[PDB]
């Protein structure tokens, strides 16, 4: 009722993935690929997909271990493996020219794709992301340590902490977190919670990867971009917003008010125009 | 005994300033200008000046309302006015080609000089600075609100909070905060404490200025630079360190261990080589 969109599935060498694919299959137009955050599903972008659909092909991907995708028992939830999932997916769908849209963890993954394959990137839109090692922001660091490590995994697997508490925590307005959205995020089972439990640990251990991506920003600078930041966000500070603008040449920042971490769900109605303007301009 | 360096004074249109000026007066060599943080004096860089002196002319400036400088009763402690103090000072001393070194508040001020007059800047070294509006770092924001506003001013003027507590708070190793350093910082009088009390408020209200400087970074990018960051700092996060490196073309970051906010005092012995290498390269 809420998610009427056509759903499809790709078998990848590391496991099958679910995706949403709206708009024409006649790919004479640019494709936009959406990458979700944690513990979210591609459903996070239901509104964004709905409206962008009539102008651009819109594809949204569920990461392995999340959403409606396969969860190999040996999958390592390193950003490197998530990047490989995205890369193979883009090739499997024939998506030769793609604008990437990423949120939270999806930021660094879309960014990484663009670093490795800038040739196939038609532009980048990032929102409330985890790009760059986070060393100074004590809010995140304290949560990362609690939600990471052994205790992290146990908290996620035993209590679904990451969905029952942390998800609402990231909303400036929890009345927009509809029961259906809450159900689908909580629909993930106990085994799926392992991938979620690992995520913040992956950030703590992926600092070398994030640092490498930062160093390669001078090359990603040739790809047009937009950075969306909520005024009440927890994953990104205005200091970072300004620093990223200073480095990522040919980019622009957007500040959204009355919005937290989960921007596309609370303010999808503003995100749509921001993305459409980007897609129209370049 | 601790600060043997020759001291001089310039009358500026906004008040007189004190400065340290070491090395030859025969300016056939590059000059390095050091800008202090808060509530510090140019004494912060005594070690850095001592060693750089024999290779480069070293000048260190006390900001109006701080150190051994004049405190006009109408001085506005906006970064804009501090930048004008630095600009006029550089012109008054004939310092035609200057490498700027800034810490804390001195960061944005040296940076601003470079934005307005990149032509006179031989390079930039910044350490634990307040560049860019700070919106996400709740540690600073909570202190800014406490140390800023009316209560901020009262806390500084009545209790010298900013020197008795905040200064030691910024050290990873307080045993390096010698009694002489402690005395000189605390030597500032109650009226001088007003300038100090305003500082964090100036940051909260100067966000437009800091934002403008950030936007002009694409032009400052033509000036070689180094960014020094303490692993236990409170004014700057590694996220920012990485972002600044990404934007400031022709720059490099340095991470110092076992050091807090007041880097040149705790680890002056590492800062000297970092600055000398920059100046040699």
Numbering used by the authors:
A (entry chain B): 26 to 307
B (entry chain A): 26 to 306
Paper quotes:
Haloalkane dehalogenases (EC 3.8.1.5, HLDs) are a group of enzymes that catalyze the hydrolytic cleavage of a carbon–halogen bond in a range of halogenated organic compounds. A distinct catalytic pentad forms the active site of HLD enzymes: a nucleophile aspartic acid, a histidine base, a catalytic acid (aspartic or glutamic acid) and two halide stabilizing residues (two tryptophans or tryptophan + asparagine) (Janssen, 2004). We show that full‐length wild‐type DhmeA forms diverse quaternary structures, ranging from small oligomers to large supramolecular ring‐like assemblies of various sizes and symmetries.
Therefore, we have used a strategy addressing the issue of non‐uniform particle orientation distribution by combining data collected at different sample tilt (Tan et al., 2017). The cryo‐EM map reconstructed from the major class of the particles present in the data showed six DhmeA molecules arranged into a D3 assembly. None of the focused data refinement strategies led to improvement of model resolution which suggests that wild‐type DhmeA forms a highly dynamic assembly. The dimerization interface seems to be tightly packed, while inter‐dimer contacts are less tight. We therefore deduce that the dimeric unit is a common building block of large assemblies formed by wild‐type DhmeA.
